[PDB]
Design an enzyme around this catalytic site. Sequence first.
Site, short mmCIF file in Angstrom:
data_model
loop_
_atom_site.label_atom_id
_atom_site.label_comp_id
_atom_site.label_asym_id
_atom_site.label_seq_id
_atom_site.Cartn_x
_atom_site.Cartn_y
_atom_site.Cartn_z
N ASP A 58 2.45 -39.35 -112.67
CA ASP A 58 2.79 -40.77 -112.86
C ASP A 58 2.78 -41.17 -114.32
O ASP A 58 1.74 -41.39 -114.94
CB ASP A 58 1.79 -41.61 -112.06
CG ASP A 58 2.16 -43.08 -112.07
OD1 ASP A 58 3.02 -43.52 -112.86
OD2 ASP A 58 1.58 -43.83 -111.25
N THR A 59 3.95 -41.30 -114.93
CA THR A 59 4.04 -41.59 -116.35
C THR A 59 3.69 -43.03 -116.67
O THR A 59 3.45 -43.34 -117.84
CB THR A 59 5.45 -41.30 -116.88
OG1 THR A 59 6.43 -41.97 -116.08
CG2 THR A 59 5.75 -39.82 -116.77
N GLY A 60 3.67 -43.86 -115.65
CA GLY A 60 3.29 -45.24 -115.83
C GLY A 60 1.81 -45.47 -115.82
O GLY A 60 1.36 -46.56 -116.15
O1 LIG Z 1 -2.77 -47.01 -109.73
S1 LIG Z 1 -1.94 -47.71 -110.74
O2 LIG Z 1 -1.75 -49.15 -110.58
C1 LIG Z 1 -2.88 -47.33 -112.16
C2 LIG Z 1 -3.28 -46.00 -112.44
C3 LIG Z 1 -4.07 -45.78 -113.60
C4 LIG Z 1 -4.42 -46.84 -114.49
C5 LIG Z 1 -4.02 -48.15 -114.19
C6 LIG Z 1 -3.24 -48.39 -113.04
N1 LIG Z 1 -0.45 -46.91 -110.82
C7 LIG Z 1 -0.24 -45.71 -109.95
C8 LIG Z 1 0.37 -46.04 -108.58
C9 LIG Z 1 -0.13 -47.13 -107.81
C10 LIG Z 1 0.46 -47.38 -106.54
C11 LIG Z 1 1.56 -46.62 -106.07
C12 LIG Z 1 2.03 -45.48 -106.80
C13 LIG Z 1 1.46 -45.27 -108.08
C14 LIG Z 1 0.57 -47.56 -111.76
C15 LIG Z 1 1.46 -46.53 -112.49
N2 LIG Z 1 2.58 -46.21 -111.55
C16 LIG Z 1 2.81 -47.40 -110.70
C17 LIG Z 1 1.56 -48.32 -110.77
N3 LIG Z 1 1.95 -49.70 -111.12
C18 LIG Z 1 2.53 -50.10 -112.42
C19 LIG Z 1 1.55 -50.35 -113.55
C20 LIG Z 1 0.25 -50.88 -113.32
C21 LIG Z 1 -0.64 -51.13 -114.40
C22 LIG Z 1 -0.25 -50.81 -115.73
C23 LIG Z 1 1.05 -50.29 -115.97
C24 LIG Z 1 1.92 -50.02 -114.89
S2 LIG Z 1 1.82 -50.94 -109.91
O3 LIG Z 1 1.79 -52.24 -110.61
O4 LIG Z 1 0.82 -50.59 -108.93
C25 LIG Z 1 3.47 -50.74 -109.28
C26 LIG Z 1 3.67 -49.98 -108.09
C27 LIG Z 1 5.00 -49.76 -107.58
C28 LIG Z 1 6.10 -50.34 -108.26
C29 LIG Z 1 5.90 -51.12 -109.44
C30 LIG Z 1 4.58 -51.34 -109.93
#
Ligand SMILES: O=S(=O)(c1ccccc1)N(Cc1ccccc1)[C@H]1CNC[C@@H]1N(Cc1ccccc1)S(=O)(=O)c1ccccc1
Lengths: 99, 99
Positions: free
Chosen positions: A25-27
């Site tokens: 997960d690059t986000g």
């Molecule tokens: O757990 S995190 O939420 C996570 C993991 C580690 C540290 C902080 C948050 N995360 C991983 C994730 C969460 C749910 C489903 C799949 C992956 C973030 C990085 N990828 C997406 C996720 N989010 C984006 C995001 C959140 C915070 C900061 C930047 C981007 S979000 O707001 O849950 C989101 C989910 C689906 C579509 C659009 C958004």
Amino acid sequence: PQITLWQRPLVTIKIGGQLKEALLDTGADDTVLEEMSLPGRWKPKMIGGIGGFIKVRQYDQILIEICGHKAIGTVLVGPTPVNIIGRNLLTQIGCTLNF
Amino acid sequence: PQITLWQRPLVTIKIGGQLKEALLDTGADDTVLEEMSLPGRWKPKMIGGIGGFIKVRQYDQILIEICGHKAIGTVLVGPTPVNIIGRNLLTQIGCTLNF
Ligand SMILES: O=S(=O)(c1ccccc1)N(Cc1ccccc1)[C@H]1CNC[C@@H]1N(Cc1ccccc1)S(=O)(=O)c1ccccc1
Ligand SMILES: [Cl-]
Ligand SMILES: [Cl-]
Ligand SMILES: [Cl-]
């Protein structure tokens, strides 16, 4: 490997002697895994996104194996709906985005 | 480009004639942007984030440019922590993960 994004980029990891499936997960700034035991000291953290925040335990300097690649880094543990490999460990295995 | 992950992979996108910053997010199935105006009708969509599911607006067949690459596809609008480019549009621009 070159990993397509037609489907979720799921990989097998080994951590704490356990095999698990996790999302590259690059986000994600951080790596977060479902509830498990890890060795050593920890401290609490909150992490959040769509739907709100969850409380996790932060363990530092944990060994992990991702697709055959060994790395060391911080792992957060808590009630995440999905196991996530975040940038803190993706950098260590040389993972890049390419287009 | 080749984008490493030591920092957040933020890029410039263009939508509705406006430039915006967005995160390339291989963990997101879908593209989700902060509240904005888009043309046409929308449909309801539930997305699962770290803290639970939330309802967002779904707009189909929207023109969007990502790092200069043209795409046309589904854009969700809702209370996302950052503008997110998810796998539906990362596939369109030919993005892969590599290590
Ligand atoms: O757990 S995190 O939420 C996570 C993991 C580690 C540290 C902080 C948050 N995360 C991983 C994730 C969460 C749910 C489903 C799949 C992956 C973030 C990085 N990828 C997406 C996720 N989010 C984006 C995001 C959140 C915070 C900061 C930047 C981007 S979000 O707001 O849950 C989101 C989910 C689906 C579509 C659009 C958004
Ligand atoms: Cl780390
Ligand atoms: Cl590097
Ligand atoms: Cl689409």
